Design a protein around this ligand. Structure first.
Ligand SMILES: Cc1cc2nc3c(=O)[nH]c(=O)nc-3n(C[C@H](O)[C@H](O)[C@H](O)COP(=O)(O)O)c2cc1C
Ligand SMILES: Cc1nc(Cl)sc1C(=O)Nc1ccc2ccccc2c1
Ligand SMILES: O=C(O)c1cc(=O)[nH]c(=O)[nH]1
Length: 365
């Protein structure tokens, strides 16, 4: 499409050449929140509809956590064409995150490295922001456009489990699903919460708090995991998920690895790497987690999705829904319709009646 080309070849490179990545992001969030977006001409066909997590999703392509950290651009994101929106991570108290600069573009690799460290307006601010549009969201969700809330923990928190529990109590009633983010590489000690005993204890508390919410305000609970886990880690996560009845998994967060072949000058910056070099590592993690959970636990696949083929590979590997973030940084808003259009075409070409038929298809061949 003309829009795709204009954004890819002209607008985005100009934006990028004029502003550092954090400023560019702040501006993108502002424009999104004002609905200043190119025409999402793409109409979602029935083939793209998915029913999972106790909800209908008009299409399976969502915006990943981190773009709208504080819940400021939710409606603009649906307008962009996303079938669902996840905000966060939100921490219990407000916090500034790491010192700048803390995000870096690797254009030669179509990758980003970030070390934001959970900059967050905090639960109270986000709660009021979501309450101000709560009934509009109730109608969106009913219409097949659900909202997810991703929870983090404060840097100085003594008790991680209580941080997450507070998030469940405060934002749980405003969310269709909650994400327990235990996979940020930018908060010290956080990833150790993926370990079997820590995870079991943490998630038992989270699920207890969730179950204590009134029925119409009771969200699904998902756990978002790293792409850098050992086989033992993945086995243990699968075991805990099945033991506790966790509703789903988000696979994956950014990687602390630096795959061979990265060309960007900034490849050795500390932080999580996202984008294209993450793609197949993420897809393989989805494939493994789907097998370990016997295809019975919904997976949202995320990491390096920039095309319909990327989306479909994750869906065939076992993802019921997919998310993207970094591709937006390079291709802008037209990438969303592009992914949906290509995905629909590929589903038809490969003989699937719809997205639902393709979920986990690789494991049945
Ligand atoms: C700048 C930036 C900030 C992010 N912040 C969060 C976050 O706060 N919580 C979270 O769970 N994931 C966060 N992520 C990870 C994304 O949600 C996603 O898992 C990861 O970037 C891989 O997807 P992608 O390759 O499409 O970007 C962030 C990613 C980036 C690039
Ligand atoms: C389309 C448009 N009209 C005016 Cl005026 S400014 C503007 C505009 O620049 N919109 C953008 C550009 C890039 C983006 C990247 C990510 C997310 C949202 C984005 C919105
Ligand atoms: O805030 C962060 O730095 C952040 C959190 C997260 O979950 N993933 C990431 O790449 N960065």
């Amino acid at each position: 499409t003309g829009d795709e080309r204009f954004y890819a070849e002209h607008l985005m490179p100009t934006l990028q050449g004029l502003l550092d990545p954090e400023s560019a992001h702040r501006l993108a969030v502002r424009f999104t929140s004002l609905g200043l977006l190119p025409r999402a001409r793409f109409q979602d066909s029935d083939m793209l509809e998915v029913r999972v997590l106790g909800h209908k999703f008009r299409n399976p392509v969502g915006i990943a956590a981190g773009f709208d950290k504080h819940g400021e651009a939710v409606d603009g994101l649906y307008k962009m064409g996303f079938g669902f929106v996840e905000i966060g991570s939100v921490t219990p108290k407000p916090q500034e995150g790491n010192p700048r600069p803390r995000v870096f573009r690797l254009p030669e690799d179509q990758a980003v490295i970030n070390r934001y460290g959970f900059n967050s307006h905090g639960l109270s601010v986000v709660e009021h922001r979501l309450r101000a549009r709560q009934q509009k969201q109730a109608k969106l969700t009913e219409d097949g456009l659900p909202l997810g809330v991703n929870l983090g923990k404060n840097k100085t928190s003594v008790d991680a489990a209580e941080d997450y529990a507070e998030g469940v109590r405060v934002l749980g009633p405003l969310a269709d699903y909650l994400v327990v983010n235990v996979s940020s590489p930018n908060t010290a000690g956080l990833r150790s919460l993926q370990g079997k005993a820590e995870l079991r204890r943490l998630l038992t508390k989270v699920l207890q708090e969730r179950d204590g919410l009134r029925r119409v305000h009771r969200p699904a609970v998902l756990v978002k995991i790293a792409p850098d886990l050992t086989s033992q880690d993945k086995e243990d996560i699968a075991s805990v998920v099945k033991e506790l009845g966790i509703d789903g998994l988000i696979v994956t967060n950014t990687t602390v690895s630096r795959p061979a072949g990265l060309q960007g000058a900034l490849r050795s910056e500390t932080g999580g790497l996202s984008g294209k070099p993450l793609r197949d590592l993420s897809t393989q993690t989805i494939r493994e987690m789907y097998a370990l959970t016997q295809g019975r636990v919904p997976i949202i696949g995320v990491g390096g999705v920039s095309s319909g083929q990327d989306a479909l590979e994750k869906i065939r590997a076992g993802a019921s829904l997919v998310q993207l973030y970094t591709a937006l940084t390079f291709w802008g808003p037209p990438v969303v319709g592009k992914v949906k259009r290509e995905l629909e075409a590929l589903l038809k070409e490969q003989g699937f009646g719809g997205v639902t038929d393709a979920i986990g298809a690789d494991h049945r061949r």
